[PDB]
Design an enzyme around this catalytic site. Structure first.
Site, PDB file in Angstrom:
ATOM      1  CE  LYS A 190       0.899  -7.043  -6.342  1.00 22.06           C
ATOM      2  NZ  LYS A 190       2.282  -6.620  -6.658  1.00 22.06           N
ATOM      3  NE  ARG A 214       3.905  -8.556  -1.041  1.00 19.70           N
ATOM      4  CZ  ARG A 214       3.667  -7.257  -1.131  1.00 19.70           C
ATOM      5  NH1 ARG A 214       2.432  -6.772  -1.080  1.00 19.70           N
ATOM      6  NH2 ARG A 214       4.691  -6.451  -1.322  1.00 19.70           N
ATOM      7  NE  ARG A 243       4.926   3.262  -6.155  1.00 19.63           N
ATOM      8  CZ  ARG A 243       4.781   1.980  -5.848  1.00 19.63           C
ATOM      9  NH1 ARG A 243       3.732   1.307  -6.288  1.00 19.63           N
ATOM     10  NH2 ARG A 243       5.663   1.383  -5.077  1.00 19.63           N
ATOM     11  NE  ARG A 276       4.155   2.833  -1.427  1.00 21.12           N
ATOM     12  CZ  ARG A 276       4.009   1.584  -1.847  1.00 21.12           C
ATOM     13  NH1 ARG A 276       3.259   1.332  -2.904  1.00 21.12           N
ATOM     14  NH2 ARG A 276       4.605   0.590  -1.213  1.00 21.12           N
ATOM     15  NE  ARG A 331       8.064  -2.298  -2.075  1.00 21.67           N
ATOM     16  CZ  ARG A 331       8.335  -1.016  -2.311  1.00 21.67           C
ATOM     17  NH1 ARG A 331       9.088  -0.322  -1.471  1.00 21.67           N
ATOM     18  NH2 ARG A 331       7.863  -0.443  -3.406  1.00 21.67           N
TER      19      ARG A 331
HETATM   20  N1  AP5 Z   1       1.092  -0.490 -17.596  1.00 21.77           N
HETATM   21  C1  AP5 Z   1       2.068   0.300 -17.157  1.00 21.77           C
HETATM   22  N2  AP5 Z   1       3.105   0.637 -17.931  1.00 21.77           N
HETATM   23  C2  AP5 Z   1       4.093   1.470 -17.408  1.00 21.77           C
HETATM   24  N3  AP5 Z   1       3.959   1.911 -16.089  1.00 21.77           N
HETATM   25  C3  AP5 Z   1       2.905   1.517 -15.361  1.00 21.77           C
HETATM   26  C4  AP5 Z   1       1.962   0.737 -15.903  1.00 21.77           C
HETATM   27  N4  AP5 Z   1       1.026   0.519 -14.989  1.00 21.77           N
HETATM   28  C5  AP5 Z   1       1.378   1.176 -13.893  1.00 21.77           C
HETATM   29  N5  AP5 Z   1       2.506   1.845 -14.134  1.00 21.77           N
HETATM   30  C6  AP5 Z   1       3.094   2.579 -12.999  1.00 21.77           C
HETATM   31  O1  AP5 Z   1       3.294   1.644 -11.944  1.00 21.77           O
HETATM   32  C7  AP5 Z   1       3.887   2.393 -10.792  1.00 21.77           C
HETATM   33  C8  AP5 Z   1       3.724   0.967 -10.220  1.00 21.77           C
HETATM   34  O2  AP5 Z   1       2.369   0.575 -10.402  1.00 21.77           O
HETATM   35  P1  AP5 Z   1       1.250   0.051  -9.416  1.00 21.77           P
HETATM   36  O3  AP5 Z   1      -0.171   0.253 -10.173  1.00 21.77           O
HETATM   37  O4  AP5 Z   1       1.304   0.752  -8.104  1.00 21.77           O
HETATM   38  O5  AP5 Z   1       1.532  -1.498  -9.418  1.00 21.77           O
HETATM   39  P2  AP5 Z   1       1.487  -2.290  -8.077  1.00 21.77           P
HETATM   40  O6  AP5 Z   1       1.674  -3.757  -8.733  1.00 21.77           O
HETATM   41  O7  AP5 Z   1       0.162  -2.187  -7.431  1.00 21.77           O
HETATM   42  O8  AP5 Z   1       2.769  -2.372  -7.134  1.00 21.77           O
HETATM   43  P3  AP5 Z   1       2.420  -3.537  -6.017  1.00 21.77           P
HETATM   44  O9  AP5 Z   1       3.668  -4.396  -5.408  1.00 21.77           O
HETATM   45  O10 AP5 Z   1       1.181  -3.320  -5.200  1.00 21.77           O
HETATM   46  O11 AP5 Z   1       3.154  -2.533  -4.953  1.00 21.77           O
HETATM   47  P4  AP5 Z   1       2.610  -1.375  -3.898  1.00 21.77           P
HETATM   48  O12 AP5 Z   1       0.984  -1.341  -3.595  1.00 21.77           O
HETATM   49  O13 AP5 Z   1       3.564  -0.968  -2.806  1.00 21.77           O
HETATM   50  O14 AP5 Z   1       2.526  -2.752  -3.006  1.00 21.77           O
HETATM   51  P5  AP5 Z   1       2.072  -2.824  -1.427  1.00 21.77           P
HETATM   52  O15 AP5 Z   1       0.976  -1.676  -1.065  1.00 21.77           O
HETATM   53  O16 AP5 Z   1       1.518  -4.175  -1.140  1.00 21.77           O
HETATM   54  O17 AP5 Z   1       3.357  -2.530  -0.518  1.00 21.77           O
HETATM   55  C9  AP5 Z   1       3.991  -3.624   0.109  1.00 21.77           C
HETATM   56  C10 AP5 Z   1       4.225  -3.191   1.563  1.00 21.77           C
HETATM   57  O18 AP5 Z   1       3.781  -3.137   2.988  1.00 21.77           O
HETATM   58  C11 AP5 Z   1       3.644  -4.418   3.559  1.00 21.77           C
HETATM   59  N6  AP5 Z   1       2.657  -5.423   2.995  1.00 21.77           N
HETATM   60  C12 AP5 Z   1       1.652  -5.205   2.141  1.00 21.77           C
HETATM   61  N7  AP5 Z   1       1.001  -6.347   1.953  1.00 21.77           N
HETATM   62  C13 AP5 Z   1       1.562  -7.270   2.726  1.00 21.77           C
HETATM   63  C14 AP5 Z   1       1.278  -8.559   2.908  1.00 21.77           C
HETATM   64  N8  AP5 Z   1       0.256  -9.045   2.209  1.00 21.77           N
HETATM   65  N9  AP5 Z   1       1.983  -9.326   3.748  1.00 21.77           N
HETATM   66  C15 AP5 Z   1       3.043  -8.757   4.454  1.00 21.77           C
HETATM   67  N10 AP5 Z   1       3.320  -7.405   4.245  1.00 21.77           N
HETATM   68  C16 AP5 Z   1       2.566  -6.691   3.395  1.00 21.77           C
HETATM   69  C17 AP5 Z   1       5.127  -4.748   3.219  1.00 21.77           C
HETATM   70  O19 AP5 Z   1       5.968  -3.658   3.579  1.00 21.77           O
HETATM   71  C18 AP5 Z   1       4.763  -4.653   1.801  1.00 21.77           C
HETATM   72  O20 AP5 Z   1       5.948  -4.859   1.022  1.00 21.77           O
HETATM   73  C19 AP5 Z   1       2.904   3.565 -11.056  1.00 21.77           C
HETATM   74  O21 AP5 Z   1       3.616   4.611 -11.669  1.00 21.77           O
HETATM   75  C20 AP5 Z   1       2.007   2.878 -12.010  1.00 21.77           C
HETATM   76  O22 AP5 Z   1       1.102   3.847 -12.561  1.00 21.77           O
END
Ligand code: AP5
Length: 214
Positions: free
Chosen positions: A13, A88, A123, A156, A167
């Site tokens: 995302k 979420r 990552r 991370r 998660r």
């Molecule tokens: N096309 C592709 N093909 C192959 N590989 C690829 C690819 N594209 C990308 N990749 C590789 O992908 C890896 C993954 O890609 P990435 O680009 O990072 O994908 P991502 O979908 O953004 O992962 P998301 O769940 O956001 O997770 P992340 O930001 O932790 O989530 P959050 O900050 O919310 O963390 C959540 C944490 O904090 C809190 N939190 C955050 N938001 C909330 C909320 N809204 N409500 C309550 N708690 C929250 C909780 O602890 C929450 O769980 C990288 O290597 C990427 O380059």
């Protein structure tokens, strides 16, 4: 233009939030980036959040909604915004709905659990900027180093595999229903929905979303 990104943690995302920001000029509101910023500032929010996040749990809806409300009620949110990590849970969604906030696009990143755990081991992040890299699939141009600053990248803290697995469990219980939630919203005419194959390479995912938003 108002957009929401749905999909399991690791689905890519944030990776695609960057591109969508810099090509259509709307702010990324990342709940994850805001929480990780709060820890770095040592605020009260940061202190409450750190342990929850460490345990791979969701932070309470109240705290999150307040946080996101603040960051929306800033400047330049008139042209639009992109939500990444919010909502979420159903209550987070209903809160937005009840506050009278509609979105133009809801975009879902489908990626099965198998891949997700294999991904996250690769990552890497540039902690100051929040720029995200994968050692195989989206590598920095220089191993271990941010493309812009040359600063060392880190892993991370919540990216150990136990914590990842939690998660995904939380996601399937709390977050997955949002797919239904926004499909139905789309069906009533209140938004547009679209699915994508996030298992694809990062350029092919970029392409489909160009193909989708225009
Ligand atoms: N096309 C592709 N093909 C192959 N590989 C690829 C690819 N594209 C990308 N990749 C590789 O992908 C890896 C993954 O890609 P990435 O680009 O990072 O994908 P991502 O979908 O953004 O992962 P998301 O769940 O956001 O997770 P992340 O930001 O932790 O989530 P959050 O900050 O919310 O963390 C959540 C944490 O904090 C809190 N939190 C955050 N938001 C909330 C909320 N809204 N409500 C309550 N708690 C929250 C909780 O602890 C929450 O769980 C990288 O290597 C990427 O380059």
């Amino acid at each position: 233009m108002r957009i929401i990104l749905l999909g399991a943690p690791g689905a890519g995302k944030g990776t695609q939030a960057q591109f969508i920001m810099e090509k259509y000029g709307i702010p990324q509101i990342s709940t994850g980036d805001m929480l990780r910023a709060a820890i770095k500032s040592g605020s009260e929010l940061g202190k409450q959040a750190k342990d929850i996040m460490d345990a791979g749990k969701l932070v309470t809806d109240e705290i999150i909604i307040a946080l996101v409300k603040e960051r929306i009620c800033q400047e330049d949110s008139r042209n639009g915004f992109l939500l990444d990590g919010f909502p979420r849970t159903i209550p987070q969604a209903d809160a937005m709905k009840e506050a009278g906030i509609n979105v133009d696009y809801v975009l879902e990143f489908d990626v099965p659990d198998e891949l997700i755990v294999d991904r996250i081991v690769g990552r890497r992040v540039h902690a100051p900027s929040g720029r995200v890299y994968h050692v195989k699939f989206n590598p920095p141009k220089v191993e271990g180093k941010d493309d812009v600053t040359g600063e060392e990248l880190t892993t991370r803290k919540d990216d150990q595999e136990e914590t990842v697995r939690k998660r995904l469990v939380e996601y399937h219980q709390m977050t997955a229903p949002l797919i239904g939630y926004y499909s139905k919203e789309a069906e009533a005419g209140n938004t547009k929905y679209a699915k994508v194959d996030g298992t694809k390479p990062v350029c092919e995912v970029r392409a489909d979303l160009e193909k989708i938003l225009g």
